[PDB]
Every structure is written in structure tokens, then in C-alpha cells.
């Protein structure tokens, strides 16, 4: 099991001549969503989206709620400011995003951290690996970089990532240990689907695994077959786990020459499988 992380994802969208912008926030420990915020909800609050965070008292909900209401206002200002920087009209919808978080080392201290901002689906500004400096994607973002340098905003990020961020992560990991500190390995199988006199499809499935990281490959006696393999995007099961499959077309009668190979952090050893009716 790799290093654990705490991360947050914010989205604000402008709706012109149709009211003020919408602000959504979500929080995760690894791939497990544990909280949400939605500026459209009555008396909007940071809400639980996992069972183990409900333990937290009212003081934790009130503080987390207030921080998200302030963010929503800050992102509305940002959307306005960006129109000026890019000389854009009032007519169109625009999007402003942020993603940030921390990772926990084997010593129980900060391993690494990040903080990124994007405008209209493009990089805007990002905190560097050293947590002491910024990378601006273009001349507009350079204005922000100068402003945040003047305010030494990087120092405020570094102190959070080293302190409160990893403090919260350790709390969440202990509180939800039964689920968060447990890797669930994949349940695997191979299906066969005839196609023509030239080919039969072999599909290698991986089901019910957690976390989402996985490696699925096909080999023909030692040589990887990725070139014309169909590898779908990792997809949610709906219960907190993930699925994936990888398929290839092989000549009829040569199914036993192909093996599927699966690596995941929940497996004591990698798996090898084949079509075995």
C-alpha cells in the first residue's frame, strides 16, 4: 500500500445574465470521497459522503462549512478578475478550478504536497515541488505570481501542508482504518467472443479493486501486445471500488498462446491468467 493522501477539488462556473456562479468542492482520502460542498444547497454545508467522517463533532462541520462559503466568494472574484486579464467579454461562461493536497511519509510527516489552479481547462498557476515558488502558464498568470510573491503565499501553503494537512490525514486514516487502510485486490477472469474466421476476442477483466491504480497487460510468450490492445479507462463500480478490462483479437485456435498479467497493491504476487473454460 503506497503513501496515503488527502486532496480537495474545487470548481466554479459563470452563468451570465443568469445569476451568480456555482461553486462545488469535494474531498478525498486516497480514492475515497468523504465530503462535499455545493453552493446551491439550502444553508450549504460541508456534508459527509462516507460513513467514518460522521463521528466528527459539530465544531468540525461548522469550521469546514465556513471555509467553503468563503472559497465560493473568492472564486467569484477570481472569475471576474480573469476577464480583465484575458480581455474577455461579459457574454460567455468560464470555468475556474483548483486541486491541492498532501501525502504521508513512512515517518508520519509530510512526504510531498501540491496546489494547482486552472482557467477554462488550461493550466493557470501552480505551486512548485519545493513549496517556496510558483510556475505561471502565461503572461496573465505572471500577474498573479507577482501578487502571491508579494504576499509570500507560498509560505502559508508550506505551513499548511506540513502541519494541518498531514494532521487531518492521520486522523482520517485512524478513524476509517477498516476501509481506508485496506487494499482490495481484483477479482479476475477471461471471456471469449467469436468474431470471424480471422479472429476471436479475448477479454481480461479486473473487478472490485481498491485503490484505482492497476496494471493490465497481455503477452504472447514474453512479448507485450499493447499496440492494438483495447484498454478501457478505469471506471467506478458504484460501491467505492473500481473496474477495468483489456481485450485483444487473436486467431481462432491460438487462444492458449496469450496470457493476461495483473499487478495491484492488494496482490501478494502478480497474477497470470488465460482462457480456461
Amino acid at each position: 500500500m503506497g503513501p496515503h493522501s488527502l486532496s480537495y477539488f474545487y470548481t466554479a462556473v459563470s452563468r451570465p445574465d443568469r445569476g451568480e456562479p456555482r461553486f462545488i468542492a469535494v474531498g478525498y482520502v486516497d480514492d475515497t470521497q468523504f465530503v462535499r460542498f455545493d453552493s446551491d444547497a439550502p444553508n450549504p454545508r460541508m456534508e459527509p459522503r462516507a460513513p467514518w467522517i460522521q463521528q466528527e463533532g459539530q465544531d468540525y462541520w461548522d469550521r469546514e462549512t465556513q471555509i467553503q462559503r468563503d472559497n465560493a466568494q473568492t472564486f467569484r472574484v477570481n472569475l471576474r478578475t480573469a476577464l480583465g486579464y484575458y480581455n474577455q467579454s461579459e457574454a460567455g461562461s468560464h470555468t475556474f478550478q483548483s486541486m491541492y493536497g498532501c501525502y504521508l511519509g513512512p515517518d508520519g510527516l509530510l512526504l510531498r504536497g501540491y496546489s494547482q489552479y486552472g482557467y477554462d481547462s488550461a493550466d493557470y498557476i501552480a505551486l512548485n515541488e519545493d513549496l517556496r515558488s510558483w510556475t505561471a502558464a502565461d503572461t496573465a498568470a505572471q500577474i498573479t505570481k507577482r501578487k502571491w510573491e508579494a504576499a509570500d503565499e507560498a509560505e502559508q501553503w508550506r505551513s499548511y501542508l506540513q502541519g494541518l494537512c498531514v494532521e487531518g490525514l492521520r486522523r482520517y486514516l485512524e478513524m476509517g482504518k477498516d476501509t481506508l487502510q485496506r487494499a482490495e485486490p481484483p477479482k479476475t477472469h477471461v471471456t471469449r467472443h467469436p468474431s470471424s474466421d480471422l479472429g476471436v476476442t479475448l477479454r481480461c477483466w479486473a473487478l472490485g479493486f481498491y485503490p484505482k491504480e492497476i496494471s493490465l497487460t497481455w503477452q504472447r510468450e514474453g512479448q507485450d501486445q499493447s499496440q492494438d490492445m483495447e484498454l478501457v479507462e478505469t471506471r467506478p463500480s458504484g460501491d467505492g471500488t473500481f473496474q477495468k478490462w483489456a481485450a485483444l483479437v487473436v486467431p481462432p485456435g491460438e487462444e492458449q498462446s496469450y496470457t493476461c498479467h495483473v499487478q495491484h497493491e492488494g496482490l501478494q504476487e502478480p497474477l497470470t491468467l488465460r482462457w480456461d473454460p
Partner: peptide
Amino acid sequence: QVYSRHPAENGKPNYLNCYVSGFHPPQ
């Protein structure tokens, strides 16, 4: 992608999923 939570079998309760990704704008 359109798919079931568990391998499908006729007459057996299951869950139907539609996963939509990689898009922009968000509407």
C-alpha cells in the same frame, strides 16, 4: 461507458452504471 456493477445474470438484481469522462465545458 455503460456497464453493470456485477457480472450480469437474468433475473438477478444488480446495478447499471453510465460513466462519462474527459469532457469540457462541464454543462
